[PDB]
Amino acid sequence: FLGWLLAPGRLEFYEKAACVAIALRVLGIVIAIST
Amino acid sequence: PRLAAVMPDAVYALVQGTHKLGEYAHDLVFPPTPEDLRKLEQQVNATIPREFDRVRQRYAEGKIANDEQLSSELEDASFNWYRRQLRTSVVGATDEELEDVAVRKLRLEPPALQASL
Amino acid sequence: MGQFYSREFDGDPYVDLMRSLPERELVWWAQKVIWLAEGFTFVDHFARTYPRLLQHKCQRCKGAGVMTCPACLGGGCRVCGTACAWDAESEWMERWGEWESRLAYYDKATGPLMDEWYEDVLNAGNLEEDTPPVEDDPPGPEVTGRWAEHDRALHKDKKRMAALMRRWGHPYDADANLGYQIVDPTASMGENVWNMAQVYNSLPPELNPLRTQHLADRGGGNTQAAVEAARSAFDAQVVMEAALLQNLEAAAQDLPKPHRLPPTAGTVACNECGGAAWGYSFFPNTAVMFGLERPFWGDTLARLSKYWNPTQVADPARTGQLLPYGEGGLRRLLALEAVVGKAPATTGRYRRDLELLLAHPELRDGALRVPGGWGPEGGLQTYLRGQQEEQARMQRRRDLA
Amino acid sequence: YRREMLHVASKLNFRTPAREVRIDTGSPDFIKWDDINGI
Amino acid sequence: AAVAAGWHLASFALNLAFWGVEGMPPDRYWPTSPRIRLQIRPGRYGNMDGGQRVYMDYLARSEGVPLN
Amino acid sequence: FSTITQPDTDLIARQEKGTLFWDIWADFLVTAADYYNEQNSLIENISNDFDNL
Ligand SMILES: [Zn+2]
Ligand SMILES: [Zn+2]
Incomplete structure (x- = not known):
């Protein structure tokens, strides 16, 4: 189960999703303090 | 980023933190020894190779470093120990010729049992 | 990006609020x-888990x-x-020799050194020479000593390097090894394949048809046929390896193996099934669902212990049978096996070779590295034949003058 | 934060005219049920 | 095999002899629209003004009118 | 039938965050407005209620 869950393709998807997530969080707070 | 690097660091940090908390749990319940700290002092001192004792004396008499000159002093000690161990691996030790290397890596000799007791 | 306008x-009520803030829209899309x-x-978890x-x-x-024969x-x-x-x-x-030869082509373990050697012989215009070493000199000839011969052979290396470079150029140009920078492990396997399937880079030269597409004549008719008949066996072996590995992966867990291969030299096919060993059934196989598949070691111990220990309840007293079961009992009842014991009969084909290895102790030194094998056409006998024929040849060359 | 409440204020009358009223019973201006008569 | 197929064939013939709803009266525990019986009605969100447009052609997709 | 026509993640998220955005914040907003009492007006509103709150 874990060998299927943490496969390289799923790993790269997790990483890209988390990157865009942290990006949008910090960008939203940047534009929210900019109000 | 790069979960493949994060997971080993995550588990390493977990177990090392647990080790620290266990050390704290053991130093408060059972307070530290006052003088056997010298026992462990000298018994971690004894296994320091000879190529480092040259700075140990240099560590005693003032002229150690500022903080940076030692951190480039013990580097070459590490490296000469490294190459010495490489030569002990390949060409053997100082009192040991190729026949004895073949003896040791073929596991031909048993540990001395008569001399044990 | 303002797509809700x-x-x-x-x-x-929420989309019109998203109209006023683009960040809400973008996080909505994410x-x-x-x-x-x-x-x-x-x-896909459900679909790979339910069939079990x-x-x-x-x-x-x-x-x-x-089953067993x-x-x-x-x-x-x-x-x-x-x-x-x-x-x-x-x-x-x-x-093994053929396979390791074919595997030597694909290999890129020494990729960096081969690459920078190709980059050194490529231009030969860099020449940022540092400080040359304090050069030794070999003990001159007429001093017969293994150390001296080692030294002389060590000093005779640069001219021989140029000689072999003449005879066999850089392998990157003879395309005997995989190309210069076809793959490196830091791009994308997506890119690395495309580069691999550009021009028959997925094969070594000896099977590549580009090497042979120019000459096929009346003489043999095998130059374009007997290489396609080798490519075919190559791909068959590769597919067999893939299948065997899928079976090993299914047996690493306790799953049933997906590929039902035909019997072999010690087994017959199961008669009850066709040789198909399992199947899907629409009925849930309660033993897997309730986790009762494997048989509890003690039970198997009892079974095997009562199967290897049959019993004789009848006694030869009444029943007139004093011989054990079997046939030809009367003829059934008619050297140094108690010390050294049996002689192993699977390895006579090496006896000869060992004898040679005893007749020439010098072959046991680390300077010699024979390819390997058993027969007269392989390994040690090749070196022996070469040595004896060359010494006789050039000694008879001495006889001319 | 501020953008959000500003936008929801920009449409405040578009939301609902439903006015919840605060009913008191102890303040003197409150009227009993038996207070109202002739009814 | 013939018997095991004739069973299904008899059942299919019986289902064919029905042919429709002629003979079947109305019923109040079982309306014809699953949405009435199951109490399904849209809310407020997910309401696009030009979604009704789509609605129409979906109807036009199934009312079989090749205009679409 | 009735299971596969429930609202999915998108609609449930819309529902609960819209209900936190519309009927708890905007009603407090209305009480603040008609206690304190066109973009410029919404500004002193967002401010005079930043000041006191
Ligand atoms: Zn057999
Ligand atoms: Zn069977």
Whole structure:
């Protein structure tokens, strides 16, 4: 189960999703303090 | 980023933190020894190779470093120990010729049992 | 990116609020795609996990699909299978040689040094020479000593390097090894394949048809046929390796193996099933669902212990049988096996070679590295024949003058 | 934060005219049910 | 095999002899629209103004009118 | 039938965050407005209620 869950393709998807997530969080707070 | 690097660091940090908390749990319940700290002092001192004792004396008499000159002093000690161990691996030790290397890596000799007791 | 403006998003209390903030719209899009990824994961987990409930196994072979031929466990048996391609022990190092040759091409373990050697011989215009070493000189000839011969052979290396470079150029140009920078492990396997399938880089030269497409004549007719007949066996062996590895992966867990291969030289096919050892059934296989598959070690111990210990309840007193079971009992009852014991009969084909290894102790030094094998056409005998024929040849060359 | 409440204020009358009223019973201006008569 | 197929064939013939709803009266525990019986009605969100447009052609997709 | 026509993640998220955005914040907003009492007006509103709150 874990060998299927943490496969390289799923790993790269997790990483890209988390990157865009942290990006949008910090960008939203940047534009929210900019109000 | 790069979960493949994060997971080993995550588990390493977990177990090392647990080790620290266990050390704290053991130093408060059972307070530290006052003088056997010298026992462990000298018994971690004894296994320091000879190529480092040259700075140990240099560590005693003032002229150690500022903080940076030692951190480039013990580097070459590490490296000469490294190459010495490489030569002990390949060409053997100082009192040991190729026949004895073949003896040791073929596991031909048993540990001395008569001399044990 | 303001996609909720055009005409037809009016009437939604939250969408019109998203009209006023682009960040809300963008995080909405991110969440929308992430939820779909999550759904795909849920479904494909379900679809690879549910089929394991419906798998049932033939109970007579226990999912093996194949039973034993006892006639062979003790010109031979004719019921039990066709011997495999590797039962021929006298063909082992030959096949291994062919395979390691083919594997030498693909190899990129020494990629960086080969690359910078190609970059050194490539331009030969850099020449940022540092400080040359304090050069030694060899002990001159007429001093016969193994150390001296080592030194002289060590000093004779640069001219021989140029000589072999003349005879065999850089392997990157003879295309004997994989190309200069076809792959490096830091790009994308997506890119690395495309580069691999550009021009027959997935094969070594000896099978590549580009090398042979120019000459095919009346003489043999094998130059374009007997290389296609080798490419075919190559791909067949590669596919067999893939299949065997899929079976090993299914047996690493306790799953039933997906590829049902034909019997072999010691086994016959199960009669109860067809040799198909399992299948799907629409009935849930309660033993897998309730986790009762494996048989609790003590039970198997009891079974095997009562199967290997039969009992004789009748006694030869009344029944007039004093001989044990079997046939030819009267003839059944008619050297140094108690010390050294048996002689192993699987390895006579090396006896000769060992004898040679005793007649020439000098062959045991580390300077010699023979390819390997057993027969007269392989390994040690090749070096012996070369040595003897060359010494006789050039000694007779001395006889001319 | 501020953008959000500003936008929801920009449409405040579009939301609902439903006015919840605060009913008191102890303040003197409150009227009993038996207070109203001739009814 | 013939018997095991004739069973299904008899059942299919019986289902064919029905042919429709002629003879079947109305019923109040079982309306014809699953949405009435199951109490399904849209809310407020997910309401696009030009979604009704789509609605129409979906109807036009199934009412079989090749205009679309 | 009735299971596969429930609202999915998108609509449930819309529902609960819209209900936190519309009927708890905007009603407090209305009480603040008609206690204190066109973009410029919404500014002193967002401010005079930043000041006191
Ligand atoms: Zn047999
Ligand atoms: Zn079977």
